[PDB]
Amino acid sequence: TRPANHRQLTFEEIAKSAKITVNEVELLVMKALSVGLVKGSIDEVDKRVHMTWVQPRVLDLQQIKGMKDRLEFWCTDVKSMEMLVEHQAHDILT
Amino acid sequence: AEVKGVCTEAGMYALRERRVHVTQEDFEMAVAKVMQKD
Amino acid sequence: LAVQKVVVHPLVLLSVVDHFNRIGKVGNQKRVVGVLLGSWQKKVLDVSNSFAVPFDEDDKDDSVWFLDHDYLENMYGMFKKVNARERIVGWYHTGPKLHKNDIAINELMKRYCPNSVLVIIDVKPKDLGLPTEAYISVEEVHDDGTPTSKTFEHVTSEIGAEEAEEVGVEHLLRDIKDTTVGTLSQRITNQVHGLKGLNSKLLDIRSYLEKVATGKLPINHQIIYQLQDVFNLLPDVSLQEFVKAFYLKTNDQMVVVYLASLIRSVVALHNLINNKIANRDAEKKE
Amino acid sequence: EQKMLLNLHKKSWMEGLTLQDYSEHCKHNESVVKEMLELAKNYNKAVEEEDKMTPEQLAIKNVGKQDPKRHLEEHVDVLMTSNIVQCLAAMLDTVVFKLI
Amino acid sequence: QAAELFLDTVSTFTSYELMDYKTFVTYTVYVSMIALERPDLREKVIKGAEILEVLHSLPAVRQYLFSLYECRYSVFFQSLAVVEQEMKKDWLFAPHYRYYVREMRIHAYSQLLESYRSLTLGYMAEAFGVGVEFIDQELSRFIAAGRLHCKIDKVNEIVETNRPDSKNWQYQETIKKGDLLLNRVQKLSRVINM
Amino acid sequence: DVLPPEADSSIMMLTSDQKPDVMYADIGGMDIQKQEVREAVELPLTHFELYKQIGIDPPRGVLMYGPPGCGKTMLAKAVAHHTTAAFIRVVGSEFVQKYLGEGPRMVRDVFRLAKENAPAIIFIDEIDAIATKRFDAQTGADREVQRILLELLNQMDGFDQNVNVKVIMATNRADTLDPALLRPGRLDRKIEFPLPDRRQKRLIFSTIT
Amino acid sequence: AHHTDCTFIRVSGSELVQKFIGEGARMVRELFVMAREHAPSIIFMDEID
Amino acid sequence: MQSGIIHAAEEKDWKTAYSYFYEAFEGYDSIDSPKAITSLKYMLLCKIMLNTPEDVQALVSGKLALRYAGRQTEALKCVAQASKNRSLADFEKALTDYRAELRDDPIISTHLAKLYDNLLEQNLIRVIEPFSRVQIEHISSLIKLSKADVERKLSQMILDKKFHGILDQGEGVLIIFDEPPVDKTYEAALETIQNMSKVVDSLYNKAKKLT
Amino acid sequence: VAKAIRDGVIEASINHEKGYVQSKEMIDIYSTREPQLAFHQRISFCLDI
Amino acid sequence: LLKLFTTMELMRWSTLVEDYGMELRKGSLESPATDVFGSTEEGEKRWKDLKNRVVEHNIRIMAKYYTRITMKRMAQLLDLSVDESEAFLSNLVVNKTIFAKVDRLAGIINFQRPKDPNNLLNDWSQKLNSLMSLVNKTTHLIAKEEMIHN
Numbered sequence A: 001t002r003p004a005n006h007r008q009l010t011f012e013e014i015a016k017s018a019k020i021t022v023n024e025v026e027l028l029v030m031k032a033l034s035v036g037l038v039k040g041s042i043d044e045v046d047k048r049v050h051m052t053w054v055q056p057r058v059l060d061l062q063q064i065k066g067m068k069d070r071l072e073f074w075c076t077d078v079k080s081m082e083m084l085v086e087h088q089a090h091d092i093l094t
Numbered sequence B: 001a002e003v004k005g006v007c008t009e010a011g012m013y014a015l016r017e018r019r020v021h022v023t024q025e026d027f028e029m030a031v032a033k034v035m036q037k038d
Numbered sequence C: 001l002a003v004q005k006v007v008v009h010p011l012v013l014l015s016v017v018d019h020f021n022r023i024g025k026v027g028n029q030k031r032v033v034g035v036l037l038g039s040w041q042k043k044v045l046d047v048s049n050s051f052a053v054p055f056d057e058d059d060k061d062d063s064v065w066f067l068d069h070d071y072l073e074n075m076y077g078m079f080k081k082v083n084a085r086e087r088i089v090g091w092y093h094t095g096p097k098l099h100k101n102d103i104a105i106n107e108l109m110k111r112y113c114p115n116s117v118l119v120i121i122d123v124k125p126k127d128l129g130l131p132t133e134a135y136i137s138v139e140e141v142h143d144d145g146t147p148t149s150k151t152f153e154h155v156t157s158e159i160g161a162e163e164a165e166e167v168g169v170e171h172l173l174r175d176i177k178d179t180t181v182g183t184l185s186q187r188i189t190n191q192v193h194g195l196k197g198l199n200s201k202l203l204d205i206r207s208y209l210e211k212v213a214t215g216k217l218p219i220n221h222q223i224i225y226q227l228q229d230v231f232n233l234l235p236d237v238s239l240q241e242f243v244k245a246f247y248l249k250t251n252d253q254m255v256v257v258y259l260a261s262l263i264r265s266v267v268a269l270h271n272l273i274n275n276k277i278a279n280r281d282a283e284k285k286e
Numbered sequence D: 001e002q003k004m005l006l007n008l009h010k011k012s013w014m015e016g017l018t019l020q021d022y023s024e025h026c027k028h029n030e031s032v033v034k035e036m037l038e039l040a041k042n043y044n045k046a047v048e049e050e051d052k053m054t055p056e057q058l059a060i061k062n063v064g065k066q067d068p069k070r071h072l073e074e075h076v077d078v079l080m081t082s083n084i085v086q087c088l089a090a091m092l093d094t095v096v097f098k099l100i
Numbered sequence E: 001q002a003a004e005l006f007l008d009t010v011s012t013f014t015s016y017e018l019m020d021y022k023t024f025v026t027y028t029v030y031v032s033m034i035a036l037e038r039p040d041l042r043e044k045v046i047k048g049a050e051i052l053e054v055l056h057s058l059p060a061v062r063q064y065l066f067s068l069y070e071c072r073y074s075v076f077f078q079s080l081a082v083v084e085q086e087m088k089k090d091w092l093f094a095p096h097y098r099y100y101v102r103e104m105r106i107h108a109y110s111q112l113l114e115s116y117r118s119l120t121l122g123y124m125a126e127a128f129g130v131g132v133e134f135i136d137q138e139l140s141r142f143i144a145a146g147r148l149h150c151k152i153d154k155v156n157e158i159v160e161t162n163r164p165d166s167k168n169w170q171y172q173e174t175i176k177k178g179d180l181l182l183n184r185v186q187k188l189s190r191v192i193n194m
Numbered sequence F: 001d002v003l004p005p006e007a008d009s010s011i012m013m014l015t016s017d018q019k020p021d022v023m024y025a026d027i028g029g030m031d032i033q034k035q036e037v038r039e040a041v042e043l044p045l046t047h048f049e050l051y052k053q054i055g056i057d058p059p060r061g062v063l064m065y066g067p068p069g070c071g072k073t074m075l076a077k078a079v080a081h082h083t084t085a086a087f088i089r090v091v092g093s094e095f096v097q098k099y100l101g102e103g104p105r106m107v108r109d110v111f112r113l114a115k116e117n118a119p120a121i122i123f124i125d126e127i128d129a130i131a132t133k134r135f136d137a138q139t140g141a142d143r144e145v146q147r148i149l150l151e152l153l154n155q156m157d158g159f160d161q162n163v164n165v166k167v168i169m170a171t172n173r174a175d176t177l178d179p180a181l182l183r184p185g186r187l188d189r190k191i192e193f194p195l196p197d198r199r200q201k202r203l204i205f206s207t208i209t
Numbered sequence G: 001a002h003h004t005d006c007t008f009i010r011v012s013g014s015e016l017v018q019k020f021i022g023e024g025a026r027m028v029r030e031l032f033v034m035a036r037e038h039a040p041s042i043i044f045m046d047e048i049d
Numbered sequence H: 001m002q003s004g005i006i007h008a009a010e011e012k013d014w015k016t017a018y019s020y021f022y023e024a025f026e027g028y029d030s031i032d033s034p035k036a037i038t039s040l041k042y043m044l045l046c047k048i049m050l051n052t053p054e055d056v057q058a059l060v061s062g063k064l065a066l067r068y069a070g071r072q073t074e075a076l077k078c079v080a081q082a083s084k085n086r087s088l089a090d091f092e093k094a095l096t097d098y099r100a101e102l103r104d105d106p107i108i109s110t111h112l113a114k115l116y117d118n119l120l121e122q123n124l125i126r127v128i129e130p131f132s133r134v135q136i137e138h139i140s141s142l143i144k145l146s147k148a149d150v151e152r153k154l155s156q157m158i159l160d161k162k163f164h165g166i167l168d169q170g171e172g173v174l175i176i177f178d179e180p181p182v183d184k185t186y187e188a189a190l191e192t193i194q195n196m197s198k199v200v201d202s203l204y205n206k207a208k209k210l211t
Numbered sequence I: 001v002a003k004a005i006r007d008g009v010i011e012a013s014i015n016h017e018k019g020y021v022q023s024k025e026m027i028d029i030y031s032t033r034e035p036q037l038a039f040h041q042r043i044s045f046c047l048d049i
Numbered sequence J: 001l002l003k004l005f006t007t008m009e010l011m012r013w014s015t016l017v018e019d020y021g022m023e024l025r026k027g028s029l030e031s032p033a034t035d036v037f038g039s040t041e042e043g044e045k046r047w048k049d050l051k052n053r054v055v056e057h058n059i060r061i062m063a064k065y066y067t068r069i070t071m072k073r074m075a076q077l078l079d080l081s082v083d084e085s086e087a088f089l090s091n092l093v094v095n096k097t098i099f100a101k102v103d104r105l106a107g108i109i110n111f112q113r114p115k116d117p118n119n120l121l122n123d124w125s126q127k128l129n130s131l132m133s134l135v136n137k138t139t140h141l142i143a144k145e146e147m148i149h150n
């Protein structure tokens, strides 16, 4: 659910969401890390879990539309930078 | 020629101890080797 | 897989183009099919020759199609007499994209070469991509419980030439190819072409997603799985650690660039010195 | 046919944006700069020698002996190209592949 | 380079037309304490047989060297004043007697601050046998020059050491020397055009 | 075109499998000869900077001479087995060839190969085949051998102090050797392999038994 | 020989150098043709004995 | 043997002393002399003073030294193990168990102090290795020495650049720093700039002389 | 000091109640774009030369 | 038991004892015990070495997953005291078995080595390469889907 910029889950968040005690949260992450469901690391000093990868899941049509909008923004960025490089280096472009 | 060989042998004795500068002991050992032994 | 890279020689491209043109002189055709001969080097295919075979198909039905396999065997023997080290490694066709009956044709070809490779060679001069697209038949074991079927797994395709083949190509490309451009300009043009190719690939993905959203195509549930990984792989360039590392690396390269430019300027001054001295000597003796 | 043959040695779009390994890139930069160190040390001597050298020896004396100026030019060209290409590719990738 | 050459010829010295051997060894020690790192100074000068044998007859120079090496900073400062008065009268060290001494002072300060995270100003003054105000002025001058990697909290009179990366110190010298070479190139081209 | 220097050589270096199995411990009672060979061959290869610092001029070549069967060729074997440098074993009679010019050509090929693979040791067993002091100008054999010897002298003379190549020549009839081969810069270290003394005899007996 | 700029010729009688002295080699005085070409010359011979 | 003894007494390089002791051991063993063990002892001792204790065991494992395997070789092997483990407590235990064979041999007894100092440095490095910020009292407890002595030794080691760190007296904590290696690229660039400035000076002479 | 801080002369702050000035911790210069800018000026000048 | 040493998760020494020690040390009449963990001196030494292997496996797992961990938490998960766990970790670090920096003043263990800019930018470049490869593969899969449903 969380965007890639905010995939740092506090121990309290996992404990509350999973209906488990805080001291067990780490062990839960261990299983999810061992099976391969998720990827990341655990910072037990700050009681946080840095999650970097998720098992891909079945998406709804609306989620696919949002993904296509993300692709629209990505295509706009790629095209803009391609035109920038073509314009700036036009004289030396082969 | 024997004196020159004594100088070279003093350098060789300095080498055998992995030293850079030739010392008087090296010259005396070279004299002993060049003259008495040979 | 059994195939890591497929190298298609320019002779194969020219033979495919010539076959397509001579068949299309009839004025009624869609694609032509032939057999690919090459050698094997580690896990890298070396497609180096080809020969046309009679082939036809129905425009409407995909199950109706005729391929002359006796012709295939006879010309395989004839080519093997000339070059024994070139064996059947697959087939080709000039259709711009795959066909529903391509799997059946690959099954027919697999008797002659068990790990047959289908190299779709687009005769039309595509501006960005390579004219060749290599595929190998695999048994796709789905996890949805659907029965295992035969699909075409893509294979990285490259155009490589033999020494004499490269000599001939350079003779034919003598006028068109411009080699005066420096290496740096070539790399920057490579970067521009990479940007264009990435834009084209992203636009293809976007078009597929647009068709899926409006229901023109069903949700594959496997392309979506790959796309989630693709979007997860997008790095965060706004991180403090990454920004500091990028700045440090850029400065490390810029100091080297500065040293190189300083040495270049000094060498250029030395060249100017030599030129002025030579001019003064020439005018002094004359 | 000319367009078809033009695809020979045409590099894939992926390696256009592909960045060289930064460890090997730094090692190469350090090695070439260390080479130009000795090359410039010899270049000074080459300038002084060519100051006092007759015009018949401008090329005969260059036979069998490396030219510090030529190797310096080659190293400069190589490092300029490599570092400029790497920097430009990294800067392009920082815009193209972005999370936002 | 003077220290390197002097240490190379400390056991082969025969140039008595230039200086006496005792004077040569004193010069060698003087340049070594300013040009050598602590391990190099220990291996070559502190444990050097010839240098120690000569220093047996030169108590002042041995005191000057070992006070720095053994971190007797007040003794080192007194010996540095004596050494300064020696350099002022030497035609070889006269142009640099102001420079050398200053550098030595920096070295001493740097040494006292090398192993400690932070030092009170009073502790520095007591170690060097000077006033707190003198330590404040000297440390401020040398930090402003960028020679000491520390900052002074005058409110609490605590010098806190820093660990700047060698990359910054290499980059600043790269800028400086590249600018010097670039000025030479520019002026050479200026000469060439006319 | 210009061919790579290591290419175009009829004589090859010793590979790992061609290394002799003779050890220094296998040789008994030649401590003086072992020390002289080590100080003149194997030590300058690894400690040339020390030789320069001290002021010693390392000997370019070594002439091992003595009565037959006194450990010359075996000491060469032990050097080849216990060296980190390239070893180029050759025999003097190999240089004399029917094709005129091939002798000097392969001599300079040997020296070029050694130079390109520095540090290297050149061993020429039975040096009398190309280093006799008498030459008949009207016989093709003596003319070719004179050419071979002159090329050998030139190759040894063209080796500056920088090139890390050591040359070893072995013979049991050094009285017949040309004096020009023993001049400084060619063979500055004549090591004699005399008949064993009583202590040498007992050392050899113990080592062999 | 070095200080007076006189050419130093060593006559060892070696046959290896005979080709340089002359293809005749029947008399040692055939070397004089070379010596006259490098006058002033110092002809040196050392008796090994 | 006397040459090696004098060489070690003058605290010169220990490689030459080891070579002299090796020749003495070979000579004494060839004639089957009772002193061949003594020259063996110092042979191992040099290896300890050369900061290469791992060789000592190999030296004992040789055929010539298998004849002399006894209390002296055991003492030197155990002190080699103490140096190899970088353990000062092992050094003291070795000095206690083999006091007759080590503390009473004058040649070894003379260098025992320097051996103790070297093992002190090694054990301090080993103790502070797993830490990035560690209380000085903990280091003293691990090393079994006074806190003042530990602090003085650590300060001297920092001044000697044996390891990278600082000493916080106010909290009495040693902070160990993972310093980065100097950039060889920048050093080479600086020296290249200097040499190219020399090149520009040569071009200056050529230009002003020829125009 | 307030004018100097506002103008960017020095990176610091003033504690009026305490009555002192706290200088900001020095930032790693080489991890910023300033070395890149200086190298840019020098590189452009060298290429112009 | 072997699966316990193959799974990439934490294993507790107390649970291991209470689940297998009787079957390993004393054994059963149906399945006799080997002399590996017998009551003799060698059996006791091998039992101690088994505990060492268990705690070292736990430290390896905790290094793979955790980036920083409290010394208290490390001791709790190792079934050891703070001093014993710290000593074992120090022994592992000295032998170069496992990298870890112990900020003992704050009671923190850092399994994360300092990030070389080479390493960080190489991770970024590897991410870019994998992204481009996945984009190409997705394009090919899209082509197959277009073929099937056209």
Ligand SMILES: Nc1ncnc2c1ncn2[C@@H]1O[C@H](COP(=O)(O)OP(=O)(O)OP(=O)(O)O)[C@@H](O)[C@H]1O
Pocket (backbone or CB within 6 Å): F026, F027, F028, F029, F030, F066, F067, F068, F069, F070, F071, F072, F073, F074, F075, F171, F172, F193, F204, F207, F208
């Ligand atoms: N010191 C030695 N210890 C043991 N064996 C020896 C020793 N010296 C010579 N030999 C014996 O010499 C034999 C071969 O002689 P070697 O080739 O070494 O002699 P050489 O001097 O090269 O002879 P030649 O002059 O006839 O070529 C070997 O089988 C070896 O056992």
Ligand SMILES: [Mg+2]
Pocket (backbone or CB within 6 Å): F072, F073, F074, F125, F170
């Ligand atoms: Mg022989």
